[PDB]
Antibody, heavy 121, light 115 residues
Framework: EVKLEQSGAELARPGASVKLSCKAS????????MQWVKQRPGQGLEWIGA????????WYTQKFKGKATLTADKSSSTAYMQLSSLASEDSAVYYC???????????????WGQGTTLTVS | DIVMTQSPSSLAMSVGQKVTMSCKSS????????????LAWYQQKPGQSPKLLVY???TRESGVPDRFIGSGSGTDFTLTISSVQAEDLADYFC?????????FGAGTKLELKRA
């Protein structure tokens, strides 16, 4: 059973930072890239960046370059994202999601994590 | 970055009616090479995370009822629900997964009229 598990919430002080975790299972972790998406109520979904776990190569959304750092631990099958200098606008639900891309067309996300509610206050 | 726009922002319909919602992008999502458009549709029911409904512009994902049909090409895409059911209540998002940034449209919120 393919699964991406995250922890339900994080409460953080403004100006501080957090390391969100996302544990994978049910598949060869290094075989697929890992994506991170941000969802604010009413705003919708926003893509933060992705990382290939096999070599650690990252690609970021210009908007989050310098706010989010992605890493992974191929030993424990966990992917990570650190968010720094948080402010009220950073409050949201953060998802890690997997992308397949075969067929000759889109990287269509096929598996999403349970999501982590982060609150800055 | 490719900008994705969706319309309408919300729609309210009673069970059994047909709905049409659109997603245009500001740049083509079609390759010049394999000829496929890199656009997916996700459904997010209240209180749940988004779930992949359709990928390529048109392949419906297994589990997804055939009342949902994705269509369109290039910059203009459509998701149609042939006869809407109460369980289709959701926000529908389209997404470019052509290239990074992967970006998403703002969503069409589908609401349900009833007795």
């Amino acid at each position: 059973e393919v699964k991406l598990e995250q922890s339900g919430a994080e409460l953080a002080r403004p100006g501080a930072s957090v390391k969100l975790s996302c544990k994978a299972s049910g598949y060869t972790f290094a075989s697929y890239w890992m994506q991170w998406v941000k969802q604010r109520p009413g705003q919708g979904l926003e893509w933060i960046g992705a990382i290939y776990p096999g070599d650690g190569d990252t690609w970021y959304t210009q908007k989050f370059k310098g706010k989010a750092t992605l890493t992974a631990d191929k030993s424990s099958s966990t992917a990570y994202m650190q968010l720094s200098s948080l402010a009220s606008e950073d409050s949201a639900v953060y998802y890690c999601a997997r992308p397949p891309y075969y067929y000759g067309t889109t990287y269509y996300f096929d598996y999403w994590g349970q999501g982590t509610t982060l609150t800055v206050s | 970055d490719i900008v994705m726009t969706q319309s309408p922002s919300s729609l309210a319909m009673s069970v059994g009616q047909k709905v049409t919602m659109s997603c245009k992008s500001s740049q083509s999502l079609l390759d010049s090479r394999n000829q496929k458009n890199y656009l997916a549709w996700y459904q997010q029911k209240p209180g749940q995370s988004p779930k992949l409904l359709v990928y390529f512009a048109s392949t419906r994902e297994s589990g997804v009822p055939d009342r949902f049909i994705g269509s369109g090409s290039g910059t203009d895409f459509t998701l149609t629900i042939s006869s809407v059911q109460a369980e289709d209540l959701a926000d529908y998002f389209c997404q470019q997964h052509y290239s990074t940034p992967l970006t998403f449209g703002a969503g069409t919120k589908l609401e349900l009229k009833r007795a």
